[PDB]
Assembly symmetry: D3
Homo-oligomer: 231 residues x 6
């Protein structure tokens, strides 16, 4: 593919998708055995290794619909990837969304025009693969990892003067990130399975930051859920 420098078979059937390529490196080195880096193009690293003797890949996506759309499209179309699991963070937009909660996104709202480009007057509601979601849910429940299932907002503007997150929160939306709508829409359009698993990095509306310790803990829980759901 244009943006990924891998050879055939170098990428696994299951790919984890952090936004930050340095977090892709961290995940692969920390969690997987026998790791190879299959991509260095643009420094958007991708790695493959094994978890309990099963091949797992980890590919950074960058930030925003347009950047993840590139990687997801190439993974699916050039590398025949079957399962695509974003592992990332979001800003919580409700008080009931706790800093320790691991979020499994059933769907996502968005201000990206990517679906109105395709559908015009239709509001397309992207949808997580239920089999992936349920496995992740079971995995959290089994260990007692606090988990919340609901929807998120996929934003184009991290700094948005016209943000509607107040209203989104009142409609039940849990948090704001910049990737999910693209991942869920593209995977579904190609008959692949996708899921986004998210930690909470702060509460956007109260400005209240999560501590470095809290983040390390939730990150490990997210990765454990991602992996465990998958073996």
């Amino acid at each position: 593919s244009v943006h990924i420098g891998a050879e055939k078979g170098q990428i696994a059937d299951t790919v984890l998708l952090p936004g930050d390529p340095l977090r892709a490196k961290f995940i692969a080195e920390t969690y997987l055995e026998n790791v190879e880096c299959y991509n260095e193009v643009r420094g958007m690293y991708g790695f493959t290794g094994t978890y309990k003797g099963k091949k797992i890949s980890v590919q950074g996506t960058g930030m925003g619909v347009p950047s993840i759309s590139i990687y997801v499209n190439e993974l699916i179309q050039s590398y025949d990837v079957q399962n695509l699991i974003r592992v990332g963070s979001c800003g919580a937009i409700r008080k009931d969304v706790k800093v320790r909660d691991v979020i499994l996104a059933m769907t996502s709202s968005t201000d990206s025009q990517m679906n109105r480009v395709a559908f015009g007057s239709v509001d397309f509601a992207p949808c997580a693969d239920f089999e992936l979601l349920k496995n992740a849910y079971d995995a959290a429940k089994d260990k007692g990892v606090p988990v919340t299932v609901g929807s998120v907002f996929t934003a184009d503007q991290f700094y948005n003067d016209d943000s509607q997150i107040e209203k989104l929160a009142k409609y039940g939306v849990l948090g704001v990130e910049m990737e999910t709508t693209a991942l869920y829409t593209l995977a579904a359009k190609h008959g692949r399975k996708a899921l986004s698993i998210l930690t909470v990095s702060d509460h956007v509306l109260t400005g209240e930051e999560t501590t470095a310790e809290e983040r390390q803990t939730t990150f490990h829980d997210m990765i454990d859920v991602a992996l465990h759901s998958v073996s």
Copy 2:
């Protein structure tokens, strides 16, 4: 409320929501003990009775976003209803959606303008209550009822010259109905729990009709899931 002639306490915390008021009558009389009809306004019947000694109501909604929106808003705001379960049918738009499958909607797409009216440039993705969905899922799995979890399309025009169901099917959408987006959006906006459970009445694209026997069978499975999930 304006459209429902009930007194306080006459409607249960849990309401099943068929589109057809005559199917509301059928459900209440067939499945519940000690049934009272609490509403006859516009002939949109609503009933309350018990299932295993727990109060359950059944309220017809009519067809279309605008009609269900009336009933859902009044149930929530005037009767403090907590759990709202549409039990209805849809036209399947994919071959892999089988006539015996009971559909649990995680979300719904729509050509209704109801959310663009509220959100403008935002695509709002409605979201089922996961607790209700998982209970329904468990209930089906427990008995071996075939069940499929994914998304549906909420249509304004049953006869639509500009239908995009071809494209919707390619994006993974399972079927087309006329209520879900409204139910999920309104329940969520008011902090209530909603779920839509759907049988398949035909395949819209092949014109192939489900038999009367097939429909009777799936209808009973839907109601059993609706109830069982709830006790």
Copy 3:
């Protein structure tokens, strides 16, 4: 048709269209001779009888664009109906619209997406059949029934947090209902004649309700205009 259980010839060339199927029953029994009920599907009753020896039908439509669209499409396409006259009520949105006024809608505005679905960037302005409107107008004038001719708003949300009726009233719009845009657009698309005749059930902005006596009186005037215009 899918939603109407009639046989050919059972429905007249001229059909009155109340929203409430129980009001369809009331109209047919009260005004017409030799009445037969040709439809009981979903309890959305339809009747045919005679008025001065001329066949007239009366078909409930339900509430909302999507519900009337079903009945209108089936009446036109399966039953070759020629004249379609909604007889209903609306909430007045101006002080100069009096509680006794019978409204004849020349056109209707809407927040339904049904026409943007068909036309995209075009604002489609639906249009009453002038021959039907003028006959109704003449009929009112002949008896001294107060009558106002202008436009209405066809709303998707009876309970609308984002209502623009304040601004609509300033642009001259008389009142808000939930059917007209669909009736006028569908009839015109198929070369049939349509008209909506409306009473005033309240003033939405002042909350001021019309009395039961006032409503009985205006209802009879509406029906008299509907009929008289037609014989």
Copy 4:
């Protein structure tokens, strides 16, 4: 006003509004007594004279929503004009619209964004003043002038590569012009009375032109209706 060089009282309560300022001159000189030109700014002539001893003004508007909007706004706001009657032509878009027919517009569709600018998700349907329309209708009928009442399309692009007039014609729309939506919307927003009366200059879809004789004849009928309706 900014664009009209008249003094107070120089413009009548009733103004005829041709698009072409040279046709304004023709109308005033040909039909009215004791004519004064009250405006020469931009050569968009405006005249006042009498018809049967009643003051009538005639003001050119130019072509397009934006140009008529200027003149209509200034006439209403600076000159307290009460009745505004466009007298113009249109391209017929249906075969049943005959070259001799004088069109009275009940409403107009448009691809101008002027109402979406004000109303967003609402389709605003402009509405002729029924009193003006009925007088014009009566006036034609009295003399046997062929007259058709229905809707027109207000176009921004005389040369439109993306024209939807085919579809508009199927929905019953009679013809295409470039002014009506603005006139009807602005007059209504300010509590004034407006009407558009139109001749047919050609059939857009067949390219078939009306003869110079046909045009002279229809023009005189239009003006006669405009005037007669008004005295």
Copy 5:
């Protein structure tokens, strides 16, 4: 063409485009030798003469996207015009835009729907011909004419209750007029060269008017730039 009464070769390769046809007359008579009026249709005058022995035409456009679109389309398609230079005025919307500044528009924003009609979900950004712009820029700089290069707003409503000029000014937009988007889009679509050169007639937000002397001076500078850039 339909709206221009000229014969072939009567219009030059280069046409100046004032909005006001009386200003077209003024420009031609004041600046050019051996002038002929080639168009009197609708009193939208067009003239051709010579400037330093080179043929130059001057064509009024009227006000608004729809009116200039007519003239520009006919000039290009029927008269094979190569260079199209609007010479007009605008209302400044920023304090830093001085009354003596001559504006060269690189692009224009708009509330016209003309490009959404063609492109739907795409924001089309029109673009001046850089060769024309640079020549005009050089011409001003050579003589010391104060000149500002940036963008303008093409408005449909001179009187706009929903104006966003406050926000437009904060994004750097210099002023508001009613023609540029159309000129730049149409010229580009047909492979011709266009440029808009504008004087400042007032500051819209402070209501502060430019004096008649200031306007005479800037007008002459605009015309000098238009001409000089061209010889």
Copy 6:
């Protein structure tokens, strides 16, 4: 700032903005003296060094409106950056755009919803800083670097099933990239100066690729123009 790990004064007044952080490293090391890396967050490298004794920074932006928007907003708001020069590539969409041409973007079209989010019914046309553009233009002309000035398309979807680049090319648009609209809109909103300078990496419509040698050559020309314009 959240995404950039620099201290105050570490970033220059002038920042070059390649999409690829590895190209930021290449540029800084190859062209500048006394280079320090001020940012390693997410591996989106930023460097500062000197060019002819003047401080210049080079900051990778990532791909897509949302990713560059992050970096541009933080550069402006936290580091008081004055001049922002994207140096990147695009896919040419016209035959007349040659592989050796260096493109200076006056404006950009887009399918991003970022401006409709802010402006609704307004098409916002972003605008390059003319002073930056003219300096870059002069710099190319001085050395004989082939240079083309016009507009580009800022795309959200590198792989777009609904691409309108065919039509965009006919309207004169030169090429497609994924950043410019954001850079130009954000810089302008904050009173900073921006310009995008682009090489051609291929012709999207013919699939014809530029050679590695051609790309090395054009890249050096782009950087030379970027720098020279600036000293």
